[PDB]
Write a protein that binds this ligand. Structure first.
Ligand SMILES: NC(=O)c1ccc[n+]([C@@H]2O[C@H](COP(=O)([O-])OP(=O)(O)OC[C@H]3O[C@@H](n4cnc5c(N)ncnc54)[C@H](OP(=O)(O)O)[C@@H]3O)[C@@H](O)[C@H]2O)c1
Ligand SMILES: NC(=O)c1ccc[n+]([C@@H]2O[C@H](COP(=O)([O-])OP(=O)(O)OC[C@H]3O[C@@H](n4cnc5c(N)ncnc54)[C@H](O)[C@@H]3O)[C@@H](O)[C@H]2O)c1
Ligand SMILES: NC(=O)c1ccc[n+]([C@@H]2O[C@H](COP(=O)([O-])OP(=O)(O)OC[C@H]3O[C@@H](n4cnc5c(N)ncnc54)[C@H](O)[C@@H]3O)[C@@H](O)[C@H]2O)c1
Ligand SMILES: [Cl-]
Lengths: 177, 372, 369
């Protein structure tokens, strides 16, 4: 259909540097990477530049109920920044950049379709964002073992690496701008 | 235009209710009838008038099941309700045949249809219906809370002008949903957390919550994920290494259970014997036997200054939020039983097929047949 | 050689011990002899052999005070210990005349010398010795823990397939050392925490830990402006801010006085069933009218816990902190292993409750008549 389009940390930093609205969507990958503190630091940084920053927490992101909540709470993220998908879905079209962090199954457009194994899962409309940046190490599939057409969309770009190492580099790249 | 029923639970220590007001309200807005036993919700602070204000009808037990097509229960229904069951009616709730043999046997005699919540399949369509996960989450959270309550030490590292105090060393033994939540809650509190499980997957998940995986000399797993049949020699070695790791802990939270079997022992007489006085074991597997040989189900014992607690219904302690989540689980499941207000059992549907323990007295679950 | 003596605490349900083995070893190494009653540290899980390994002599109670200059206690000494005291000896521990007036009265009669640990000045300089601070920290920690245990609701926010659990709204009324630690622990557990106190400093401290300060406005240092217009202001306002709360942790206390009634009946009647109250001030009456000291009751679905002696529940770390508080204080009592009280020091002047039997503390002296 489309294509995998890798992006450098520097390219992503420029995208975030000029974004007005940014949404972080963390998954299991953030947790494996224990990247919650760096992700919080990035969110702080963007905010101090007048960027409107939000987190969308999917109901089954990670590997236990409330997995993203316990980590984000640990990192010091404000409850008012954490949006659940009924409140944040209609907002995605006006989102300049959705930064997906170690998430896959919970941002897969296939769950809308009845044939797909992900049907039944509530849908997070990150594919309606103006630009998507997906952080994952490479070609690792999610829990459900299905490939993600999101990664192949025109407006999706892949930021390959370990979640925390990447975010660390993004912060440093952004501090230089 | 279906009528679904929800009884007051009877099992020892059960304070949960299968449906709460807000979820009952939506079922009624959805065009369904709801018969609720007098005071079924009081254990979860949901009074009789709350259900009336939701469009439900509060009636007597015995009258409860007349005209009823769906029985929604937390624990399996006693005899009196099994006798009250009508033709075509579906029982929905936890059943757990290994702990309720008689109630299951009785359910054949009436030839009732039952779908068991513990057999809700682990596929994406059934995630919102997964009652085990939601209830285990409550248990894991409270397991950590009780652990801190019973411990004579701080969980968190504390530094003050009086000096510096190390954080507690907590080990969660058995890392399912309950285990994971126990880890997470002990970790928030500031405890140094360690994780023991035979599955590499569980251990990775424990690491995704900041816990330190306890790694023994022999790995318990191989390619394909198959568990190693350990020799006696290899088995003597795992035990001795684990005995040592466990001996250095201030808290042990044990959660390991296996569907249909008594809980496996993870703390043996010799392991407990090597725990320092002051140590705390919170045994979540007590409801099916306990992972700790000292455990007395429902009690807090102390032997050699090792405080051992075996809680039997943690969900019933967190009754409000445990009930709320269970209600929603059942509500989401009612998708496959109700269509536009109508009794529409989708027997065809996998979730119904995988979880349907019985169809009118006929027992469909393989392992449930073997036991009975 | 200065001999320090440590008794087995005997007050109902007291499990703390004045010195723990590791502090004993610091004293012995510094030149001091140490005698410890047989079984003194069993409430805090320090067996006799541990004190022996630290260089102390484990003795029978009747023997404990032979030759000892310093008697270190958690709660005041019972009469059997009071009588066995040598001349020149100094008792060091909590005294608080109100729970133990007849034991204090007994001490002056024996003409003993005692330093009351609650009479340590509440200043930065003294915090290493401050037993009130350390033990209140323990109490505040365990308060939150109990609140969570008693609540039928999760503390933390959780986004799950079975819906979104909202965080518990927890209000800590009275933000001193206990309260602030109760804020930190409720916060660790994911609760949304609110903080009420009559003092703006306490409010700024609570903001700094991430609690939302309650809307004031009285200064009341240090029931002063509190009972200006007789505290109808306090009652009026929080009657609204309290109703939303899932948990109320109350710790407000005034020295030598009744503890303020922050929770009247008309107030508790607005609490939703399942609400939990943890009244730390139970020992001097309650902040809540429904509190039954040392018990959990439930009226109208409001679970009210009035814990007494939380420090005794956390016996290992309570004893440890307490022992360090005494060790640090003992620097004003010992010189290279010699009995050398610093009568001059302003911490000793503030806390010396009696000497040679004469009672030097005003409010206390008045109560002896
Ligand atoms: N929440 C629950 O309670 C629960 C329980 C059981 C199952 N589930 C199911 O689990 C899934 C959760 O979805 P999700 O989007 O959170 O996770 P997911 O769909 O399992 O995908 C996780 C992604 O993380 C990436 N990753 C792993 N380590 C990383 C690292 N160090 N740095 C950066 N990325 C890393 C992986 O790819 P790379 O190998 O390319 O890095 C992987 O693609 C859903 O299918 C849910 O239905 C949820
Ligand atoms: N998600 C799953 O795959 C799964 C599977 C079974 C049960 N569960 C449920 O999840 C909850 C959490 O428990 P758990 O499964 O995380 O515990 P777990 O993964 O630790 O397994 C149970 C115990 O079985 C023992 N065991 C198995 N094979 C062994 C061997 N060869 N040698 C020595 N010991 C061996 C281990 O000590 C192990 O701790 C339980 O309530 C359980 O009912 C989940
Ligand atoms: N180094 C330091 O700066 C330091 C260290 C520790 C403690 N302290 C100070 O010691 C003093 C006493 O501390 P404590 O924990 O023993 O206090 P305490 O045991 O007397 O408890 C009283 C706490 O509750 C509050 N309170 C009392 N009455 C109230 C009412 N009617 N309504 C609302 N709140 C009320 C008080 O303002 C105080 O914060 C405090 O000023 C504390 O700041 C200072
Ligand atoms: Cl309690």
């Amino acid at each position: 259909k489309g294509s995998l389009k890798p992006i450098d940390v520097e390219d992503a930093a420029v995208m975030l540097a000029y974004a007005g609205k940014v949404v972080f969507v963390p998954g299991y990958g953030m947790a494996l990477s224990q990247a919650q503190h760096k992700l919080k630091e990035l969110a702080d940084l963007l905010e101090a530049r007048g960027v409107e920053v939000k987190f969308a927490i999917h109901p089954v992101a990670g590997r236990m109920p409330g997995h993203m909540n316990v980590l984000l709470a640990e990192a010091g993220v404000d409850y008012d920044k954490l949006k659940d998908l009924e409140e944040i879905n209609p907002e995605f079209p006006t989102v300049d950049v959705a930064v997906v962090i170690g998430a896959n199954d919970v941002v897969n457009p296939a769950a809308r379709r009845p044939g797909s194994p992900l049907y039944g899962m509530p849908i997070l409309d990150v594919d309606k964002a103006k630009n998507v940046i997906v952080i994952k190490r490479g070609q690792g599939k999610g829990f459900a073992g299905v490939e993600n057409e999101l990664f192949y969309a025109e407006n999706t770009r892949m930021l390959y690496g370990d979640a925390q190492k990447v975010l660390t580099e993004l912060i440093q790249a952004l501090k230089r701008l | 235009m279906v009528t679904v029923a929800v009884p007051k639970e009877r099992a020892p220590g059960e304070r949960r209710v299968a449906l709460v007001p807000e979820v009952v309200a939506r079922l009624v807005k959805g065009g369904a009838r709801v018969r609720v036993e007098r005071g079924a919700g009081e254990g979860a602070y949901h009074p009789d008038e709350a259900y009336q204000e939701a469009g439900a009808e509060v009636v007597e037990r015995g009258e409860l099941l007349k005209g009823a097509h769906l029985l929604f229960t937390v624990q399996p229904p006693p005899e009196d309700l099994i006798q009250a069951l009508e033709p075509g009616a579906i029982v929905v709730g936890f059943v757990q045949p290994h702990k309720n043999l008689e109630l299951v046997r009785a359910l054949q005699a009436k030839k009732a249809t039952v779908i068991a919540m513990e057999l809700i399949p682990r596929i994406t369509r059934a995630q919102s219906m997964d009652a085990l996960s939601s209830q285990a989450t409550v248990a894991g959270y409270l397991a950590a809370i009780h652990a801190a309550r019973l411990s004579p030490r701080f969980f968190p590292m504390l530094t003050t002008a009086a000096g510096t105090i190390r954080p507690a060393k907590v080990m969660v033994m058995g890392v399912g949903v309950a285990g994971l939540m126990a880890i997470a809650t002990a970790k928030r509190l500031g405890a140094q957390v360690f994780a023991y499980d035979v599955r590499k997957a569980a251990l990775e998940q424990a690491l995704s919550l900041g816990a330190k995986p306890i790694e023994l000399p022999i790995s318990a797993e191989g390619e394909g994920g198959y568990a190693r049949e350990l020799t006696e020699e290899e088995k003597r070695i795992q035990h001795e290494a684990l005995r040592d790791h466990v001996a250095g802990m201030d808290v042990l939270i044990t959660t390991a259970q296996v569907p249909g079997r008594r809980a496996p022992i993870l703390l043996t007489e010799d392991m407990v014997e090597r725990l320092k006085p002051g140590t705390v074991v919170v045994d979540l597997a007590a409801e099916s036997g306990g992972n700790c040989v000292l455990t007395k189900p429902g009690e807090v014992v102390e032997v050699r200054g090792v405080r051992v607690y075996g809680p039997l219904n943690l969900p019933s302690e967190l009754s409000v939020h445990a009930s709320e989540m269970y209600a929603k689980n059942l509500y989401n499941l009612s998708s496959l039983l109700i269509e536009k207000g109508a009794f529409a059992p989708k027997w065809e549907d996998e979730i119904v097929r995988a979880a349907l323990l019985m169809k009118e007295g006929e027992v469909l679950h393989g392992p449930t047949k073997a036991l009975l």
